[PDB]
Every structure is written in structure tokens, then in C-alpha cells.
Amino acid sequence: SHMTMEQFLTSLDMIRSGCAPKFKLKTEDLDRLRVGDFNFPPSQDLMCYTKCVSLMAGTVNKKGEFNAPKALAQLPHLVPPEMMEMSRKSVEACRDTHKQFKESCERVYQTAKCFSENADGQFMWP
């Protein structure tokens, strides 16, 4: 019921593989999100890609509403022990970001961006 850092790093690629084919995406954009650099304008496809990833994680519903209690319960299935506290801190800081947006892909993308900005360590997106 926990993952090692090695398993986490590899999981990023497996998660991406289940979402990227549904969209038209630029490799440079994915590379930037992979290192937690959300400092560039996203396309709708890129935003919806973040929703696809989060749906797989079970942290949002299809309306893009972020579920903090469920996200906290899913953390051991998503990140290694080394990143748990950073992630718990970001879940709390970003739990209401979705309330500022109406469209599902934007709700998720803005939440992921908030996680990347609040991260007190390196942040990696699938």
C-alpha cells in the first residue's frame, strides 16, 4: 500500500500513456508540466489532459470538482512517503481553487497549477 520513489517516477509515464492519446498535445508542454513548470498558457487540450490524469487518480469527479478528503485518502496510492507531507500541504492550500472556475478542465488545471505553485519541493506532473 505504498510506492517507492522508483515506482513513482515510472508511474508518471504509465499515467501519461492513458491520457495523452485522447488529446492533441505538444511534447514541450508535457515536459514543462513534468517538472512542475505551469508558467505558460495552456491549450484546452492540455487542461483536459490534466483532468484525465486527475480522474485516473480519483482526486476529482467528471465535473472537475476536487475532493480533498478523497485526495488525502488516495495519497499513498499516488506519491511516495518522501512526498506525502508536501502533497498534504498542497491539498490543503489548493482544495478550494476549483470553486473559482465553472468548466471542468479549467477547474482541474487551475488546481494542478496551484499544487505546482504551492509545492515546497520539486513537483512532478504525469
Residue type at 15 in one-letter notation? I
Q: From CA 33, how far away is CA 46, in angstroms rounded?
A: 10
Q: From CA 82, how far away is CA 56, in angstroms rounded?
A: 22
Q: 50 labelled as ligand-binding?
A: no
Please tell me what DSSP assigns to residue 120: S
Residue type at 60 in one-letter notation? V
CB contact at 8 A, 126 and 53: yes
Length of the chain: 126
Q: 54 labelled as ligand-binding?
A: yes
**Which positions make up the binding site for butan-1-ol?**
54, 59
**Which positions make up the binding site for ethanol?**
54, 59
**Which positions make up the binding site for 1-propanol?**
54, 59
**Which positions make up the binding site?**
54, 59
